[PDB]
């Protein structure tokens, strides 16, 4: 049993009635001396090290060749100047185990934390030495954390997190979808199955496609509209009491379905191909609030009768048992969507936070023509709320993060997924999120469920949106370009800014206002001026913000995950034969109260927090619900209906203690 494990385990040995929190600083020091330093490859100087790494195929050559060696040296020196030390065993362990470049035999460490950061910065900055230094400072201060794939792979010999694919209703489309999914998965891939014909309509349903996908599986998801005939077969794939193992599933729920469940009365689901034959459009592209009755009354449309209330009960029961399915409240997405003129949002991604327009492609045999629509891909990164607040750097961090995300989009080169390639170039979408909400709040004596916490989040995320929009317009001005069909968006018409020009979003509680001291809080006048700047120059990015789960990288950042409440004050996890303990970052004997566990919170107040944040996020927020086995099916439906009521866009995996 190594000494770092022994020391880490001492945290849980009570001394004077308390946990020994300070033992983890001893643990990480022992790991740092006797594992990290011990196993770091020796190089005589940086030049030899970089020549070795390029020559032996670890790093790409081109991005480094954009700089003089002396500039590369100064960038590296910038990273080391911080004197950064991981404050916990698990933060260091996660970096050095999952991200640090190792030799090909995997025995030795080629990168310090600082080395990965310097390489990432040099990659982002594209030959601009001063900007590379700004990127180093941003990352070494732990103000901004690029997503796992960017952070891991930048500089090494594509970096995009999420892919979302439309699938048209043919065998050749299905076959291409499988093929594309396989090639992109070597990323997370989510598929919309709502255009596929239901069981019986193939004269030679969707569960058959899910089976092929599940076997093919990176990680996969599939989404289906609640009105598709196959909805019950789709849900039954996740029955414990049954005979899809790996594939995640989401259900898309229009307001019309929620309404039909309120109006406790019979409802119908549809055979999509009969809709397509009859109307010449996919059911998935039609407005169900408008069309439902016409589908019911049309005799050339085939339907099945169901109890809508019992379907909603079954969703909640399945969620309680399996965690699945994810739910998208489609109208909560589209009533605030900037780009409905391109399309309505019809589905989401593996983690349920990506929410964008898409258009189905048509892949045909050798004798016909392919037609390339619009799939979705989004590269990601997260602000560290705590370090951003402490450095008073909301504006700088948002704008510089935005540049880094833009650089990754510009350098993305996707082959063999043509609607993905088309979408990246046309849409230019990015996904800036945030982490450490609960930890920041807790370390400042603010309970997650308090009105003060929501007040903070309201102001913080309004600021993120302001500076994100401002940077997007600045880039559009500098480049003389906007995203494809920007002119038809709510940014262009001005409608997007309605609430921001008429309503103030500065803190209503003085304790919260004091946290923002030293940073300018945008006012209605700043927003009026931003709206006019956007009117003149447009925006570069079709979408900008989304809050992903940040499960792995949050350890590297010593951050609470995403904007969620913490699940466990102290995580126990097994490490070979031993155990490891990870107290929540910042947890101390005297602030125990403020690190309240999510399972003990009122989920209605968690919903209020996420709704508050969501006002200022153009895409979505991966929103885990935290339940107890004592809750009734009715309690679960009530939480979900409240989420819907409060404008929540998606809910993710349901966790039961």
What is the experimental resolution, given in Å to one decimal place?
A: 2.0
SS3 for 335-379 is CCCCCCCCCCCCCCCCCCCCCCCCECCECCCCCCCCECCECEEEE
Q: Do 166 and 295 reside in the same domain of the chain?
A: no
- Please, are residues 219 and 188 in contact by the beta-carbon 8 Å criterion? yes
- Please, are residues 77 and 112 in contact by the beta-carbon 8 Å criterion? no
Alpha-carbon distance 272 to 234, whole Å? 15
CATH of the domain at 157: 3.20.70.20
Q: Do 170 and 114 reside in the same domain of the chain?
A: no
Alpha-carbon distance 439 to 562, whole Å? 10
- Please, are residues 594 and 445 in contact by the beta-carbon 8 Å criterion? yes
User: Quick one: tokens of 268?
Assistant: 């119908």
- Please, are residues 168 and 360 in contact by the beta-carbon 8 Å criterion? yes
- Please, are residues 164 and 349 in contact by the beta-carbon 8 Å criterion? yes
Q: Do 354 and 288 reside in the same domain of the chain?
A: no
Phi/psi for 371 (5° steps) reads: -120, 125
As a whole number of Å, the CA-based R_g of the chain is 25
Alpha-carbon distance 137 to 131, whole Å? 10
Q: Do 283 and 350 reside in the same domain of the chain?
A: no
Alpha-carbon distance 181 to 184, whole Å? 5
Last residue of one domain, picked from the residues 288, 307, 326 = 307
Nearest to 553 by CA among 158, 219, 159, 151: 151
Q: Do 112 and 149 reside in the same domain of the chain?
A: no
Q: Which one-letter DSSP state was computed for residue 302?
A: -
- Please, are residues 140 and 79 in contact by the beta-carbon 8 Å criterion? yes
Looking at the DSSP bridge assignments, the partners of residue 627 are 656
- Angle (CA) 95-381-89 rounded to 5° is 20
Q: Which residue has the tokens 């020091």?
A: 29
Q: Do 603 and 579 reside in the same domain of the chain?
A: yes
User: Quick one: tokens of 605?
Assistant: 């107040």
Last residue of one domain, picked from the residues 142, 175, 205 = 142
User: Quick one: tokens of 329?
Assistant: 């409240």
Residue 266, Cβ density class (10 Å: 0-12 exposed, 13-18 middle, ≥19 buried): exposed
443: CB partners within 8 A, 6+ apart = 386, 586, 591, 594
Alpha-carbon distance 490 to 496, whole Å? 5
525: CB partners within 8 A, 6+ apart = none
Alpha-carbon distance 272 to 299, whole Å? 14
Q: Do 265 and 375 reside in the same domain of the chain?
A: no
Last residue of one domain, picked from the residues 307, 322, 339 = 307
Q: Do 267 and 345 reside in the same domain of the chain?
A: no
Phi/psi for 122 (5° steps) reads: -65, -40
Q: Which residue has the tokens 């060696």?
A: 69
Quote the number of domains for the chain: 3
Q: Do 266 and 198 reside in the same domain of the chain?
A: no
DSSP for 462-481, written as a single string: HHHHHHHHHHHHHHHHHHT-
Alpha-carbon distance 309 to 637, whole Å? 10
Write out the catalytic residue numbers. Answer: 349, 351, 353
Alpha-carbon distance 543 to 89, whole Å? 37
DSSP for 247-296, written as a single string: -EEEEEE-HHHHHHHHTTS-EEEE-HHHHHHHHSS-GGGS-HHHHHHHHH
Q: Which residue has the tokens 């317009």?
A: 473
Nearest to 152 by CA among 187, 182, 190, 183: 187
The experimental method is X-ray
236: CB partners within 8 A, 6+ apart = 207, 242
Q: Do 269 and 331 reside in the same domain of the chain?
A: no
Which domain range does residue 8 map to? 3-142
Alpha-carbon distance 321 to 312, whole Å? 14
Task: Return the percent helix, strand and coil in the chain, to nearest 5.
Answer: 50, 15, 40
Helix (H) or strand (E) holding 162: strand 162-166
User: Quick one: tokens of 384?
Assistant: 């560290």
Q: Do 332 and 410 reside in the same domain of the chain?
A: yes
SS3 at position 605: helix
Alpha-carbon distance 39 to 55, whole Å? 21
- Angle (CA) 151-119-406 rounded to 5° is 60
Alpha-carbon distance 646 to 649, whole Å? 9
Dihedral over Cα of 107, 111, 112, 116: its sign: negative
Q: Do 179 and 261 reside in the same domain of the chain?
A: no
């Amino acid at each position: 049993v190594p000494k770092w494990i022994q020391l880490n385990n001492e945290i849980m040995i009570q001394k004077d009635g308390k946990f020994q929190f300070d033992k983890d600083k001893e643990a990480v020091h022992s790991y740092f001396v006797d594992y990290i330093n011990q196993n770091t490859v020796f190089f005589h100087n940086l030049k030899e090290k970089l020549d070795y790494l390029v020559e032996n195929q670890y790093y790409e050559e081109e991005f480094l060749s954009l700089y003089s060696f002396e500039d590369i040296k100064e960038v590296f020196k910038t990273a080391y100047a911080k004197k950064f030390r991981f404050p916990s065993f698990m933060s260091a362990f996660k970096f050095y185990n999952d991200y640090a470049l190792k030799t090909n035999d995997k025995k030795k460490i080629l990168e310090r934390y600082e080395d990965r950061i310097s390489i990432v910065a040099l990659f982002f900055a594209n030959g601009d030495t001063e900007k590379a230094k700004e990127y180093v400072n941003l990352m070494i201060n732990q103000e901004y954390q690029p997503s796992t794939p960017t952070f891991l792979n930048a500089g090494r010999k594509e970096l995009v997190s999420c892919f979302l694919l439309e699938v048209n209703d043919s065998l050749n489309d299905i076959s291409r979808a499988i093929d594309i999914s396989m090639q992109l998965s070597k990323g997370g891939v989510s598929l919309n199955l709502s255009k596929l014909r239901a069981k019986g309509e193939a004269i030679k349903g969707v569960v058959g496609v899910m089976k092929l996908l599940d076997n093919a599986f990176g990680s996969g998801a599939a989404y289906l509209n609640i009105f598709h005939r196959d909805i019950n077969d789709f849900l039954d794939t996740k029955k414990i009491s049954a005979d899809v193992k790996t594939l995640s599933i989401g259900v898309v729920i229009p307001d019309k379905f929620v309404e039909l469940a309120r109006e406790d009365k019979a409802a119908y689901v549809f055979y999509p191909h009969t809709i397509y034959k009859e109307y010449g459009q996919h059911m998935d592209e039609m407005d169900m609030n408008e069309m439902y009755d016409k589908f019911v009354d049309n005799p050339r449309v085939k339907k099945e009768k169901i109890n809508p209330r019992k379907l909603l009960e079954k969703l909640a029961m399945l969620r309680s048992e399996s965690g699945y399915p994810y739910i998208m409240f489609q109208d909560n997405v589209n009533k605030v969507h900037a780009n409905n003129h391109i399309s309505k949002v019809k589905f989401s991604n593996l983690c349920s936070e990506v929410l964008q327009a898409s258009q189905v492609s048509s892949y045909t045999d050798y004798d016909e023509e392919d037609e390339i629509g619009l799939d979705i891909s989004c590269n990601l990164g997260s602000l560290n709320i705590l370090n951003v607040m402490e450095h008073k750097s909301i504006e700088k961090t948002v704008k510089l993060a935005t540049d880094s995300l833009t650089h990754v989009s510009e350098t993305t080169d996707i082959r063999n997924a043509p609607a993905v390639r088309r979408a990246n170039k046309a849409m230019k979408s990015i996904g800036l999120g945030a982490m450490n909400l609960h930890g920041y709040l807790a370390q400042n004596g603010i309970a997650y469920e308090s009105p003060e916490a929501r007040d903070f989040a309201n102001t913080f995320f309004m600021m993120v949106n302001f500076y994100s929009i401002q940077r997007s317009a600045e880039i559009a001005k500098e480049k003389g370009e906007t995203f494809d069909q920007y002119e038809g968006s709510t940014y262009a018409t001005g409608e997007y800014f309605d609430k921001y020009v008429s309503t103030d979003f500065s803190p209503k509680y003085e304790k919260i206002a004091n946290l923002f001291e030293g940073m300018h809080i945008p006012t209605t006048e700043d927003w009026k001026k931003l709206k006019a700047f956007v009117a003149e120059h447009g925006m570069y990015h079709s979408y900008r913000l989304c809050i992903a789960p940040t499960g792995s990288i949050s350890y590297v950042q010593s951050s609470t995950a995403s904007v969620m409440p913490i699940m466990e004050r102290i995580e126990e996890r097994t490490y070979g034969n031993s155990k490891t303990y990870y107290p929540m970052p910042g947890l101390a004997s005297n602030n125990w109260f403020f690190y309240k566990e999510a399972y003990d919170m009122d989920m209605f107040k968690v919903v209020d927090m996420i709704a508050t944040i969501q006002q200022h996020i153009d895409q979505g927020i991966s929103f885990t619900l935290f339940l107890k086995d004592t809750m009734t099916t009715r309690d679960l439906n009530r939480i979900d209906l409240y989420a819907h009521h409060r404008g929540i866009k998606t809910i993710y995996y349901a966790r039961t203690k």
